[PDB]
Amino acid sequence: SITRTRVSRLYGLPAANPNNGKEYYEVAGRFSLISLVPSNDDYQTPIT
Amino acid sequence: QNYGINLPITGSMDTAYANSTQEETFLTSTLCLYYPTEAATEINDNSWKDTLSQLFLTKGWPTGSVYFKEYTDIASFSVDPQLYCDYNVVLMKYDATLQLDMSELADLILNEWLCNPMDITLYYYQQTDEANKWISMGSSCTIKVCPLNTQTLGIGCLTTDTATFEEVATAEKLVITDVVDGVNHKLDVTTATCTIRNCKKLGPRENVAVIQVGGSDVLDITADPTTAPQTERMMRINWKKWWQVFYTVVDYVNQIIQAMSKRSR
Numbered sequence: 604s605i606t607r608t609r610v611s612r613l614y615g616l617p618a619a620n621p622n623n624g625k626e627y628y629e630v631a632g633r634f635s636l637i638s639l640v641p642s643n644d645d646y647q648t649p650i651t
Numbered sequence: 652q653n654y655g656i657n658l659p660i661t662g663s664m665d666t667a668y669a670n671s672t673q674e675e676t677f678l679t680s681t682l683c684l685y686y687p688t689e690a691a692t693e694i695n696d697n698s699w700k701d702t703l704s705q706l707f708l709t710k711g712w713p714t715g716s717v718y719f720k721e722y723t724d725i726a727s728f729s730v731d732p733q734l735y736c737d738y739n740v741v742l743m744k745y746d747a748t749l750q751l752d753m754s755e756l757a758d759l760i761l762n763e764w765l766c767n768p769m770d771i772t773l774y775y776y777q778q779t780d781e782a783n784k785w786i787s788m789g790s791s792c793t794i795k796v797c798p799l800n801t802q803t804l805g806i807g808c809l810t811t812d813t814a815t816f817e818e819v820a821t822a823e824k825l826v827i828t829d830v831v832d833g834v835n836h837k838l839d840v841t842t843a844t845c846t847i848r849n850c851k852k853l854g855p856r857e858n859v860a861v862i863q864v865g866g867s868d869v870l871d872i873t874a875d876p877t878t879a880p881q882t883e884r885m886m887r888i889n890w891k892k893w894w895q896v897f898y899t900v901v902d903y904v905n906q907i908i909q910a911m912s913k914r915s916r
């Protein structure tokens with residue numbers, strides 16, 4: 604809200620000071636991904 | 652008593668046939684049966700061993716000369732079979748999916764193998780004759796082979812990428828491998844749960860007697876695909892119960908022991 608105004612009990616994030624003093628917002632977790640990465644294992648190397 | 656040597660023996664053809672050593676060999680020898688758990692399960696009796704012993708006592712075998720030694724399954728039996736008696740009998744159930752394993756068991760016990768050890772991390776091994784095979788025991792053996800050429804390089808495989816090796820076994824409790832005799836092989840094996848031994852098949856063991864209980868005769872002892880023999884101590888029976896089988900064995904225990912002969916080594 605904004606004291607001394609008619610804007611009261613509005614729901615949302617105001618863009619005036621979003622960080623609110625914090626150095627950074629952090630979120631932890633894991634994640635798995637598929638890829639088509641290249642390899643031989645171990646062919647195309649010299650015969651010896 | 653010249654042991655460690657082999658000398659010419661001699662005799663004649665005028666000497667008469669001596670007495671029957673039966674009724675004495677039974678007394679100064681021992682008989683060990685190897686039955687499957689299914690037999691005692693079907694039976695559901697606690698005194699069947701004393702019963703068969705009192706029955707043997709009529710044939711001549713005394714009370715404490717007979718031994719029974721159970722085994723849950725053919726593979727658990729194949730896992731380090733330790734047959735230490737003077738006359739061994741082995742009753743073997745038939746299963747078309749277990750054919751190769753119950754033939755390897757036969758090729759392992761019916762014969763007498765001279766077994767040297769093996770270390771895969773250091774050496775690369777080759778076979779010399781057609782009877783120098785590799786027998787692997789354990790709980791789950793996964794054996795892969797990569798043959799090598801004259802200049803120590805693989806043939807359709809690479810000496811680093813074990814996945815390119817050629818697979819001959821996959822989680823088998825007993826394996827008997829023959830490969831091309833004249834080529835060095837690099838091996839991958841589950842050393843932790845399996846021991847492999849390089850063994851030479853010597854002359855046969857005349858001390859055991861396998862008795863297939865069910866299906867037709869399939870056991871190809873000789874690895875070579877030309878003989879497919881049926882030895883004298885390779886017996887067959889057709890079954891619907893087990894008491895009939897044990898009574899048959901007891902009634903014809905003399906023919907069995909005539910087919911068997913006390914060991915040499």
Ligand SMILES: *[C@@H]1O[C@H](CO)[C@@H](O)[C@H](O)[C@H]1NC(C)=O
Nearest residue numbers: 667668669670671672673675
């Ligand atoms: C050999 O067998 C015959 C016939 O039973 C018997 O009379 C003889 O006593 C036996 N020999 C010996 C040394 O007991």
Ligand SMILES: [Ca+2]
Nearest residue numbers: 752823825826
């Ligand atoms: Ca097998």
Ligand SMILES: [Ca+2]
Nearest residue numbers: 781829830832
């Ligand atoms: Ca061979």
Ligand SMILES: [Ca+2]
Nearest residue numbers: 807808815816
């Ligand atoms: Ca390959």
